[PDB]
């Protein structure tokens, strides 16, 4: 009934209201011209908690399903897809808004290899367009990813490699690997030397975020809230970059949800600057990503730690809703966003924790389910057999 | 992941095959024939789990969802209100098959007091069916009874008192109060001098298991299982009797569902007679002599299972597999379903579906007698993971 499930929550002290131009509406609009042109496109639902809203004491919750992206169950390709044709259309002298699939595919040549390291979503967008451009694909996973994630990457013809290692001490290797044998790395994170290609990526996620305003456009309400889960922080900062250049960072109260075990945006916000620190499948670390904590550290509201029981519970409320909300399947690091309204909901502290989050009778929250149920045992331990619950 | 839950299967060591003319076909027809006259009423689904069956490894899971029943979220009233009807009809000297559920509705007569104990559907289709025919109810709830259940009897004009005894002592204190004012006792269980009620209940229920019959002939198949969870033994006596009548005793694998903490009628099937002995709707305390009867000779095996067991089958229920459609199901109206679940993910899974002779040609009936009646426990159940299974 009552109970308490760890909620840390850090004002943004370094907020300064400062957006990017390169993280903005425009970008994100040609990303979706390229996007509107893939076979089988179509805006993912953004579903209407009514039900839901009027027992947590907001006026609505929104809900980005990302788990009908295409067959991805997954948003990541929005990013890695686009990023990829980019750099084909760079090195074989081609232009981006007049690509065909079907010629790539067949065509003969030099073939490209694409390297990654992923956890799941990441390298299966890769994957995905790695086989749809007729190129190659590397992805390494570390020790301890599931099988069907593996499956699902090899079923796109790709080669995956499970380390055993843990994610860090894989990247390092998919790297070495990399410069050896003249493969194309396409992380989802930057560093000194690196920031051409998941600037893409992250332009491309904006997608989910111009298609969410237009839907929201089309049901006549204005978001006062945004929950971003955040990994390294390449969605959330491509996403909020959008969002803050329609609505204006003053007027949107962002806050960005992680994990107690890795952390990394959480501590950065803390202490002012980058902080280094198993998980769930998704959100996991190690480093943040300086293109997305640019975005964050500048338009950021609030900063969330959470436990790993959050995402667990984001999970079932979702899965079996209430009243007569609409029904959204969504995978741990998917749901953790949604979690955090449930956590808040069903602790003792409940007003104070509402009070700091700026909860109300009149808020609008817009929540991202990143991902469904990429991993089915997993999924279905959760919300049928009670794995990692409250008590 | 792989689990063992406690499932407890015995045979029926007493099965005979005897059916029931009592409980068959043709009065059950005749109690569906009153409930097609009362406004609102409609077939309950019968959900077909295409994929979830798929899954555990059998042709087909039908789930027969009786929380749509007349918006009282519970099968309870076919009986409860056919036994009313029937006992007003006596009152007044009227033919219950020629005249309309309105006709009683504003019938002429002296004012009749319907007392029962409940601990929580069976009160309510007796308080629900005295406030449309203007009679009163006074219904009588055990210690520890769910304020919310006390509510929805108290939001249907009748009275509702809180007990501070255990179920046994408050029927006893419904039967002692009832003789000092005159009331009319309406029990869903029988016991010596007390069987014509109870009879008419479990007539009554039947409805459901009738409707479930026209609605598999439609979908064209033939359930091979049936699952049957047990309080006092009413509801399995009232639709075993009638699924028996129909498809024969032989022919029907028919399971009876019961928690351990109350497990009265698999006890009854392991030692010989009634042994006198949880979640809310299957308490029981001492079985059915009318319902027993039937379990006795048509009942292929009993289950004693653990209360997680119900509890994995409320989730599973509310959060479907596949495309499966989605169905409420309280505590006592999930443990049917829970069962099969819990076969499915259970080391010994090869030899339990070998005992319950399920495979890939079962056809599954399964009822789901409540929905959430307990708002509370049953989203402490499926969001907060409360009666996890580790």
């Not at 027992?55 to 169950?73: A, H, P, T, Y």
């Not at 750099?87 to 694409?114: Q, V, W």
């Not at 998941?198 to 456009?217: H, K, N, S």
């Not at 309204?341 to 991202?368: F, G, T």
Request: charged fraction near 20%; include cysteine.
């Amino acid at each position: 009934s009552v109970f308490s499930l760890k909620i840390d929550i850090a004002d943004n002290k370094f907020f300064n209201g400062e957006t990017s131009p390169l993280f903005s509406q425009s970008q994100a609009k040609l990303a979706r011209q390229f996007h509107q042109k893939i076979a089988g496109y179509r805006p993912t639902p953004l579903c209407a908690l009514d039900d839901l809203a009027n027992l947590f004491g907001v006026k609505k919750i929104l809900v980005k399903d990302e788990s009908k992206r295409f067959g991805l169950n997954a948003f990541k390709m929005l990013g890695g897809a686009y990023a990829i044709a980019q750099l084909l259309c760079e090195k074989y002298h081609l232009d981006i808004e007049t690509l065909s699939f079907e010629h790539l595919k067949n065509a003969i040549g030099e073939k490209m290899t694409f390297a990654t390291t992923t956890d799941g979503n990441h390298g299966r967008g890769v994957a995905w367009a790695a086989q749809q451009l007729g190129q190659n694909a590397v992805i390494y996973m570390p020790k301890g990813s599931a099988q069907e994630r593996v499956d699902a990457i090899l079923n796109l013809g790709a080669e995956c490699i499970v380390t055993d290692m843990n994610y860090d001490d894989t990247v390092r290797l998919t790297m070495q690997h990399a410069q050896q044998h003249g493969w194309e790395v396409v992380q989802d994170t930057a560093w000194e030397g690196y920031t051409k290609i998941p600037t893409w990526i992250m332009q491309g996620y904006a997608t989910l975020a111009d298609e969410a305003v237009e839907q929201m456009r089309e049901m006549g309400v204005t978001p006062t809230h945004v929950l971003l889960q955040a990994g390294v922080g390449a969605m959330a900062g491509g996403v909020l970059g959008y969002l803050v250049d329609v609505y204006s960072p003053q007027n949107l109260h962002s806050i960005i949800v992680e994990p107690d075990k890795a952390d990394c945006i959480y501590r950065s916000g803390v202490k002012g600057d980058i902080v280094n620190v198993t998980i769930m499948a998704g959100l996991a670390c190690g480093e943040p990503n300086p293109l997305g904590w640019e975005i964050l550290r500048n338009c950021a509201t609030q900063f969330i730690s959470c436990q790993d029981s959050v995402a667990a519970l984001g999970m079932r409320v979702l899965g079996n809703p209430y009243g007569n909300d609409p029904r959204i399947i969504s995978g741990e690091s998917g749901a953790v966003g949604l979690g955090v309204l449930a956590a808040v909901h069903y602790h003792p502290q409940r007003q104070s924790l509402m009070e700091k989050l700026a909860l109300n009778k009149d808020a609008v929250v817009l929540v991202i389910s990143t991902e469904g149920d990429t991993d089915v045992k997993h999924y279905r331990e959760v919300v049928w057999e009670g794995k990692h619950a409250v008590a």
